[PDB]
Coordinates of C-alpha atoms (C1' of nucleotides) in Angstrom, one line a residue:
Chain A
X1 CA 23.2 8.3 21.1
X2 CA 19.5 8.2 20.5
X3 CA 18.0 4.6 20.0
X4 CA 15.0 5.3 17.8
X5 CA 12.7 4.2 20.7
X6 CA 10.4 7.3 21.2
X7 CA 7.3 6.1 19.3
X8 CA 5.0 3.2 19.3
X9 CA 3.9 2.6 15.5
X10 CA 1.7 -0.1 14.2
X11 CA 1.1 -1.2 10.6
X12 CA -2.2 -3.0 10.0
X13 CA -2.8 -5.0 6.7
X14 CA -6.0 -6.4 5.8
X15 CA -5.3 -10.1 4.9
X16 CA -6.3 -10.5 1.1
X17 CA -8.5 -7.6 1.5
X18 CA -10.4 -8.0 -1.8
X19 CA -11.0 -11.7 -1.3
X20 CA -12.2 -10.9 2.3
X21 CA -14.7 -8.4 0.8
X22 CA -16.2 -10.8 -1.6
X23 CA -16.2 -13.7 1.0
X24 CA -18.2 -11.5 3.4
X25 CA -20.6 -10.7 0.7
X26 CA -20.9 -14.4 -0.6
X27 CA -20.6 -16.9 2.2
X28 CA -20.2 -19.8 -0.3
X29 CA -16.6 -18.5 -0.8
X30 CA -15.6 -18.5 2.8
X31 CA -12.7 -20.8 3.8
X32 CA -12.2 -21.8 0.3
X33 CA -9.4 -21.3 -2.1
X34 CA -10.6 -18.3 -3.9
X35 CA -9.1 -15.4 -5.8
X36 CA -10.3 -11.9 -7.0
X37 CA -9.8 -11.4 -10.9
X38 CA -10.5 -8.6 -13.2
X39 CA -11.5 -8.9 -17.0
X40 CA -12.5 -12.5 -17.3
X41 CA -12.1 -12.7 -21.1
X42 CA -8.4 -12.7 -21.4
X43 CA -6.9 -15.9 -20.1
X44 CA -9.6 -16.1 -17.5
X45 CA -8.8 -12.7 -15.9
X46 CA -5.8 -11.3 -13.9
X47 CA -5.7 -12.3 -10.3
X48 CA -5.1 -9.4 -7.9
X49 CA -5.9 -10.9 -4.6
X50 CA -5.6 -14.6 -3.3
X51 CA -7.0 -16.2 -0.3
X52 CA -4.4 -18.1 1.9
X53 CA -6.0 -21.4 1.2
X54 CA -5.3 -20.5 -2.5
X55 CA -1.7 -19.4 -1.8
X56 CA -1.0 -22.9 -0.4
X57 CA -1.4 -24.3 -3.9
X58 CA 1.0 -21.6 -5.3
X59 CA -1.5 -19.2 -6.6
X60 CA -0.1 -15.6 -6.6
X61 CA -1.2 -12.1 -7.6
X62 CA -0.3 -11.1 -11.1
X63 CA -1.2 -14.6 -12.3
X64 CA -3.6 -15.3 -15.2
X65 CA -6.6 -17.2 -13.7
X66 CA -6.3 -19.9 -16.5
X67 CA -2.8 -20.6 -15.0
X68 CA -3.9 -20.4 -11.4
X69 CA -6.6 -23.0 -12.2
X70 CA -3.9 -25.4 -13.3
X71 CA -2.3 -25.1 -10.0
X72 CA -5.6 -25.2 -8.2
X73 CA -8.4 -26.9 -10.0
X74 CA -11.0 -26.1 -7.4
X75 CA -10.0 -22.4 -7.1
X76 CA -13.2 -20.2 -6.8
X77 CA -13.0 -16.7 -8.6
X78 CA -14.8 -13.3 -7.9
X79 CA -14.7 -10.7 -10.5
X80 CA -14.1 -7.1 -10.0
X81 CA -17.2 -5.1 -11.0
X82 CA -17.0 -3.3 -14.4
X83 CA -18.5 0.0 -15.1
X84 CA -18.1 1.9 -18.4
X85 CA -15.7 -0.7 -19.8
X86 CA -13.3 -0.7 -17.0
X87 CA -12.8 -2.3 -13.5
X88 CA -14.6 -0.3 -10.8
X89 CA -13.1 -0.7 -7.3
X90 CA -15.9 1.2 -5.4
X91 CA -16.9 -1.8 -3.4
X92 CA -13.5 -2.2 -1.9
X93 CA -12.9 1.5 -1.4
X94 CA -16.2 1.5 0.6
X95 CA -15.1 -1.4 2.6
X96 CA -11.7 0.2 3.2
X97 CA -13.5 3.4 4.7
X98 CA -15.4 1.0 7.0
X99 CA -12.2 -0.3 8.5
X100 CA -10.3 3.1 8.5
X101 CA -13.2 4.7 10.5
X102 CA -13.1 2.0 13.2
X103 CA -9.2 2.2 13.6
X104 CA -9.4 5.9 13.8
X105 CA -11.4 5.6 17.2
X106 CA -8.2 4.0 18.7
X107 CA -5.4 6.3 17.5
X108 CA -4.0 8.5 14.7
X109 CA -3.9 6.7 11.3
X110 CA -2.0 7.3 8.1
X111 CA -3.8 5.5 5.1
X112 CA -1.1 3.7 3.2
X113 CA -3.2 2.1 0.6
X114 CA -6.7 0.7 0.2
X115 CA -5.7 -2.3 2.5
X116 CA -2.9 -0.9 4.8
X117 CA -2.7 1.8 7.4
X118 CA -0.1 3.0 9.9
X119 CA -1.1 3.8 13.4
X120 CA 0.7 6.1 15.8
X121 CA 0.0 4.6 19.3
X122 CA 2.4 6.6 21.3
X123 CA -0.2 8.9 23.1
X124 CA -2.9 6.0 23.4
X125 CA -0.1 3.9 25.1
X126 CA 0.8 6.7 27.5
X127 CA -2.9 7.1 28.7
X128 CA -3.1 3.4 28.9
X129 CA -0.1 3.1 31.1
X130 CA -1.5 5.6 33.5
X131 CA -4.7 3.7 33.9
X132 CA -2.6 0.6 34.7
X133 CA -1.3 2.0 38.0
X134 CA 1.3 -0.8 38.0
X135 CA -0.3 -4.0 37.3
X136 CA 1.3 -6.9 35.3
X137 CA 0.1 -7.4 31.6
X138 CA -1.4 -10.9 31.4
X139 CA -0.8 -13.1 28.3
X140 CA -4.6 -13.1 28.1
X141 CA -4.4 -9.7 26.7
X142 CA -2.1 -10.8 23.9
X143 CA -3.9 -13.8 22.3
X144 CA -2.6 -13.5 18.8
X145 CA 0.7 -11.7 19.4
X146 CA 4.1 -13.0 18.5
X147 CA 7.4 -11.7 19.9
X148 CA 9.9 -11.6 17.3
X149 CA 13.3 -13.5 18.4
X150 CA 11.5 -15.5 21.1
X151 CA 11.4 -18.2 22.2
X152 CA 15.2 -18.7 22.7
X153 CA 17.5 -20.6 24.9
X154 CA 17.7 -23.7 27.1
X160 CA 7.1 -27.4 21.8
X161 CA 6.4 -29.1 18.2
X162 CA 3.6 -26.9 17.1
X163 CA 3.0 -23.2 16.2
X164 CA 0.7 -22.0 18.9
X165 CA 2.9 -23.5 21.6
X166 CA 6.0 -21.7 20.3
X167 CA 3.9 -18.4 20.2
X168 CA 2.9 -18.6 23.8
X169 CA 6.3 -19.8 25.0
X170 CA 7.9 -16.7 23.3
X171 CA 5.1 -14.4 24.9
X172 CA 5.7 -16.0 28.2
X173 CA 9.6 -15.3 28.1
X174 CA 8.6 -11.7 27.0
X175 CA 6.1 -11.1 29.7
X176 CA 8.2 -12.7 32.4
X177 CA 11.1 -10.3 31.7
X178 CA 9.0 -7.2 31.4
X179 CA 9.8 -4.2 33.8
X180 CA 6.3 -3.0 34.5
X181 CA 7.2 -0.4 37.3
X182 CA 9.2 1.8 34.6
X183 CA 6.5 3.7 32.5
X184 CA 9.4 4.8 30.2
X185 CA 10.8 1.5 29.1
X186 CA 10.4 1.2 25.4
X187 CA 9.7 -2.6 25.7
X188 CA 6.8 -1.9 28.1
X189 CA 5.6 0.7 25.7
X190 CA 5.6 -1.7 22.7
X191 CA 3.8 -4.2 24.8
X192 CA 1.0 -1.9 25.8
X193 CA 0.9 -0.8 22.0
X194 CA 0.3 -4.5 21.2
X195 CA -2.4 -4.8 23.7
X196 CA -4.2 -1.9 22.0
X197 CA -3.7 -3.3 18.5
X198 CA -5.3 -6.5 19.7
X199 CA -8.3 -4.5 20.8
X200 CA -8.5 -2.6 17.5
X201 CA -8.2 -5.8 15.4
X202 CA -10.9 -7.4 17.6
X203 CA -13.1 -4.4 17.0
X204 CA -12.4 -4.4 13.2
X205 CA -13.3 -8.0 13.0
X206 CA -16.6 -7.7 15.4
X207 CA -17.8 -4.6 13.5
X208 CA -16.9 -5.6 9.9
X209 CA -16.1 -9.3 9.8
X210 CA -12.7 -8.6 8.5
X211 CA -9.6 -10.1 9.7
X212 CA -6.1 -8.5 9.6
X213 CA -2.4 -8.8 10.6
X214 CA -0.5 -6.1 12.3
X215 CA 3.2 -5.2 13.1
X216 CA 4.1 -3.2 16.2
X217 CA 7.4 -1.5 16.7
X218 CA 9.0 1.8 17.0
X219 CA 8.8 3.1 13.5
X220 CA 6.9 2.5 10.2
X221 CA 9.6 0.5 8.5
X222 CA 9.9 -2.0 11.3
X223 CA 6.1 -2.1 11.9
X224 CA 5.7 -3.1 8.2
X225 CA 8.4 -5.5 8.3
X226 CA 7.0 -7.0 11.6
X227 CA 3.4 -7.2 10.0
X228 CA 4.6 -9.8 7.5
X229 CA 6.4 -12.1 9.7
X230 CA 3.2 -14.1 11.1
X231 CA 0.2 -14.0 8.6
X232 CA -2.7 -14.2 8.5
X233 CA -4.7 -12.9 11.4
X234 CA -1.8 -12.5 13.6
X235 CA 0.2 -9.6 15.0
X236 CA 4.0 -9.4 15.6
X237 CA 6.0 -7.1 18.0
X238 CA 9.5 -6.3 16.8
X239 CA 11.5 -4.7 19.8
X240 CA 14.5 -2.6 19.3
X241 CA 16.6 -5.3 21.0
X242 CA 15.6 -7.8 18.4
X243 CA 16.9 -5.8 15.3
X244 CA 20.5 -7.0 15.2
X245 CA 19.6 -10.7 15.0
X246 CA 16.5 -10.1 12.8
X247 CA 18.6 -8.0 10.4
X248 CA 21.5 -10.2 10.4
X249 CA 19.9 -12.5 7.8
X250 CA 17.3 -10.2 6.5
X251 CA 17.6 -9.6 2.7
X252 CA 18.0 -5.9 1.8
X253 CA 15.2 -6.1 -0.6
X254 CA 12.6 -6.9 2.2
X255 CA 12.8 -3.3 3.9
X256 CA 10.2 -0.8 2.6
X257 CA 11.8 1.4 -0.2
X258 CA 14.7 -1.0 -0.8
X259 CA 12.7 -3.6 -3.1
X260 CA 13.7 -1.7 -6.3
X261 CA 16.6 0.0 -8.0
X262 CA 18.2 1.6 -4.9
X263 CA 18.0 -1.6 -2.9
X264 CA 19.7 -3.6 -5.9
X265 CA 22.4 -0.8 -6.2
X266 CA 23.1 -1.0 -2.4
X267 CA 23.7 -4.8 -2.8
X268 CA 25.8 -4.4 -6.0
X269 CA 27.7 -1.3 -5.1
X270 CA 28.4 -2.5 -1.4
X271 CA 28.8 -6.4 -2.1
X272 CA 26.4 -7.5 0.8
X273 CA 23.1 -9.3 0.9
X274 CA 21.6 -8.5 4.5
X275 CA 20.4 -5.5 6.2
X276 CA 22.7 -5.9 9.2
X277 CA 25.8 -5.8 6.9
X278 CA 25.2 -2.1 6.3
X279 CA 26.3 -1.3 9.9
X280 CA 30.2 -1.6 8.8
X281 CA 29.9 1.5 6.7
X282 CA 30.3 5.2 8.0
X283 CA 27.4 7.4 7.4
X284 CA 29.8 9.5 5.2
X285 CA 30.4 6.3 3.1
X286 CA 26.9 5.6 2.6
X287 CA 26.0 9.2 1.6
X288 CA 28.9 9.1 -1.0
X289 CA 27.4 6.0 -2.8
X290 CA 23.6 6.9 -2.4
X291 CA 23.4 10.6 -1.6
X292 CA 22.9 12.8 1.4
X293 CA 19.4 11.7 2.2
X294 CA 19.5 7.9 1.4
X295 CA 22.8 7.5 3.1
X296 CA 21.7 9.0 6.3
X297 CA 18.5 7.0 6.2
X298 CA 20.4 3.7 5.5
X299 CA 22.9 4.4 8.3
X300 CA 19.9 4.9 10.9
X301 CA 17.8 2.3 9.4
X302 CA 20.2 -0.6 9.6
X303 CA 20.4 0.0 13.3
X304 CA 16.5 -0.2 13.4
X305 CA 16.1 3.7 13.5
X306 CA 13.8 5.7 11.3
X307 CA 11.9 8.9 12.0
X308 CA 9.3 9.1 9.1
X309 CA 6.1 10.3 10.8
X310 CA 2.7 8.7 10.7
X311 CA 1.0 11.5 9.0
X312 CA -2.6 12.3 10.1
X313 CA -4.2 11.5 6.9
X314 CA -7.1 9.2 6.6
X315 CA -8.2 10.3 3.0
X316 CA -6.4 9.8 -0.2
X317 CA -4.6 13.0 -1.6
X318 CA -5.5 12.1 -5.3
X319 CA -8.5 10.6 -7.1
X320 CA -7.6 8.8 -10.3
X321 CA -8.9 6.6 -13.1
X322 CA -6.8 4.8 -15.7
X323 CA -7.0 2.1 -18.1
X324 CA -4.4 0.0 -20.1
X325 CA -5.1 -0.7 -23.7
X326 CA -2.3 -3.4 -24.5
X327 CA -1.4 -5.3 -27.7
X328 CA -4.0 -5.1 -30.5
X329 CA -6.3 -2.9 -28.4
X330 CA -4.3 0.1 -28.4
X331 CA -6.4 3.1 -29.3
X332 CA -5.6 4.2 -32.8
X333 CA -8.4 6.6 -33.9
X334 CA -9.2 10.0 -32.6
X335 CA -12.8 9.1 -31.8
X336 CA -11.7 6.0 -29.8
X337 CA -9.5 8.2 -27.6
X338 CA -12.2 10.6 -27.1
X339 CA -14.7 7.9 -26.1
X340 CA -12.4 6.5 -23.5
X341 CA -11.4 9.9 -22.0
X342 CA -15.1 10.3 -21.7
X343 CA -15.5 7.1 -19.9
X344 CA -12.7 7.8 -17.5
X345 CA -14.0 11.3 -16.9
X346 CA -17.4 10.1 -16.0
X347 CA -16.1 7.6 -13.3
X348 CA -13.9 10.3 -12.1
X349 CA -16.9 12.8 -11.8
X350 CA -18.9 10.3 -9.9
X351 CA -16.1 9.7 -7.5
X352 CA -15.3 13.4 -7.2
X353 CA -18.9 14.4 -6.3
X354 CA -18.9 11.7 -3.8
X355 CA -15.7 13.0 -2.2
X356 CA -17.0 16.6 -2.2
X357 CA -20.1 15.5 -0.4
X358 CA -18.4 13.1 2.2
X359 CA -15.2 15.0 2.8
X360 CA -15.8 18.6 2.3
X361 CA -13.2 19.4 -0.2
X362 CA -12.8 20.1 -4.0
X363 CA -10.1 19.1 -6.3
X364 CA -8.6 21.8 -8.5
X365 CA -6.2 20.3 -10.9
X366 CA -6.6 17.7 -13.5
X367 CA -3.7 15.6 -14.5
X368 CA -3.7 13.7 -17.7
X369 CA -1.1 11.0 -18.6
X370 CA -0.8 8.7 -21.7
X371 CA 1.4 5.9 -23.0
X372 CA 2.3 5.6 -26.6
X373 CA 2.8 2.0 -28.2
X374 CA 6.6 1.2 -28.2
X375 CA 7.4 3.4 -25.2
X376 CA 9.2 1.7 -22.2
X377 CA 7.9 3.2 -19.0
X378 CA 4.8 3.5 -17.1
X379 CA 3.9 7.0 -18.4
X380 CA 5.0 8.6 -21.7
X381 CA 3.8 12.1 -21.1
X382 CA 2.0 14.0 -18.1
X383 CA 0.2 17.3 -18.7
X384 CA -2.2 19.2 -16.3
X385 CA -4.9 21.7 -16.6
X386 CA -7.5 23.5 -14.5
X387 CA -10.2 21.6 -12.9
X388 CA -12.9 24.0 -12.3
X389 CA -16.2 22.2 -12.6
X390 CA -17.1 18.5 -11.7
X391 CA -18.4 17.9 -15.3
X392 CA -17.3 14.7 -17.3
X393 CA -17.8 16.3 -20.8
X394 CA -15.6 19.4 -20.0
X395 CA -13.0 17.2 -18.2
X396 CA -12.6 15.0 -21.3
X397 CA -12.6 17.9 -23.6
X398 CA -9.9 19.5 -21.6
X399 CA -7.9 16.2 -21.3
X400 CA -8.1 15.7 -25.1
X401 CA -7.0 19.4 -25.7
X402 CA -3.8 19.1 -23.7
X403 CA -2.7 15.9 -25.4
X404 CA -4.1 16.2 -28.9
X405 CA -0.7 17.5 -30.1
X406 CA 1.1 14.3 -29.2
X407 CA -0.7 12.8 -32.3
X408 CA 2.1 12.4 -34.9
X409 CA -0.2 11.3 -37.7
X410 CA -1.1 13.9 -40.5
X411 CA -4.5 12.5 -40.7
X412 CA -7.2 14.2 -38.4
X413 CA -9.1 10.8 -38.4
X414 CA -6.4 8.6 -36.8
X415 CA -4.0 8.4 -33.9
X416 CA -0.6 7.4 -34.2
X417 CA 1.3 6.3 -32.4
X418 CA -1.4 4.1 -30.8
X419 CA -2.3 4.9 -27.2
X420 CA -1.6 1.9 -24.8
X421 CA -2.7 3.8 -21.5
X422 CA -5.1 6.8 -20.4
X423 CA -5.0 8.3 -16.9
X424 CA -7.0 11.2 -15.5
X425 CA -6.2 12.2 -11.9
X426 CA -7.8 14.9 -9.8
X427 CA -5.2 16.5 -7.5
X428 CA -4.6 19.7 -5.4
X429 CA -7.6 19.5 -3.2
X430 CA -8.8 22.5 -1.3
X431 CA -11.3 22.9 1.7
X432 CA -14.9 23.1 0.5
Chain G
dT1 C1' -2.0 -7.8 -21.9
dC2 C1' -5.5 -0.1 -11.3
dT3 C1' -4.1 2.7 -8.7
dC4 C1' -1.4 6.0 -4.7
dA5 C1' 2.6 8.6 -2.4
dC6 C1' 7.1 10.9 -2.8
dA7 C1' 11.6 12.9 -4.2
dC8 C1' 14.5 15.1 -8.1
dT9 C1' 15.1 18.6 -11.1
Chain U
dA1 C1' 5.5 21.7 -13.9
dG2 C1' 7.1 17.1 -15.7
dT3 C1' 9.5 12.7 -14.7
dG4 C1' 11.2 8.6 -12.3
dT5 C1' 10.7 5.4 -8.4
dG6 C1' 8.5 2.3 -4.9
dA7 C1' 4.4 0.1 -3.4
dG8 C1' -0.2 -2.4 -2.9

DNA sequence: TCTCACACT
DNA sequence: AGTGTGAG
């Protein structure tokens, strides 16, 4: 029976990335409690990223800055740039490309979000193991690495625990066997240390990483020791790790499916899933989900690191909540035009940088009173990178959702506009 | 009180 | 194509 030990996969996460970008640019912010906000006018702005000094006071994302200032009176704030009446994330997108370009010198990367990427290290590990002839791996090559589950068995401070765990790991490693999964993970950790050092040297940015045999465990590992640290989760560490791991902590189980796993099966922790047969899990959750859960609770997952450094879609959206919901036709057209102009700028940039053209334009709106993220999605052809045509076309394919008899007004009022360019072709 | 990927149908 | 879900 296969053990899910065929690959070495990392997940790298830029520690509070937007904050780090503003702290690099403004040295006054470095090593302070600070947060990044957008839209300062309403309750001081919505916090979207928080430094670890500020998290110590209890400041979190999705907090209003006025409320964060009550927890942390000396909190320093940086504001997202605004363009055409909306938040503009270009500075962070550009910083993200800086980091991804460095990472891709070391291995194959899948961009997961603006601040996270998965790394497939299997091949880089192989070549490094050949160059190693048969030498032991010194703890000096792993200065920021934690081994999950260690130390164990027969020091009062955190760095002492880290090194004792590392020593126990390395003292047991079988270095003559170039196919040992634990050795391959270890070499993977050595490479991630070098990649993280290169990112910090060449950009100033720090990051955490998880190293394991698949994306779910790497992502889990990454969050175990933060910030500016990396954690190795071996296959052998999974039973103990999962024995007290809430189901909602595993990637894709933090929502409704995870809640139904908990309620239907009457369990709380990932390891308790091992009691069920694969057929049992498939009967409750479907063929795909059931098979996935059966393997995943044993630490096995086969989702590939896709070779994808660039986003698949380029989108622009703005919410219009409460009294600001768009209620007149000229209001709707003006904002469509604003969104189309930012989209055009980014699409032209994309065509010149990455040699591709988008071919489909997706329009999505939300009407006041609706319950879900999007009320309605329609698409049309994207034939020219021209903001006025894109906004005209977006309006055309949604102008019929207007329930009002009057030409002049829009009912029900629109609480969200969304333009997204999709279906990219080589150019 | 902004994005991005993926599976179902 | 259009919708729902999960995540940062």
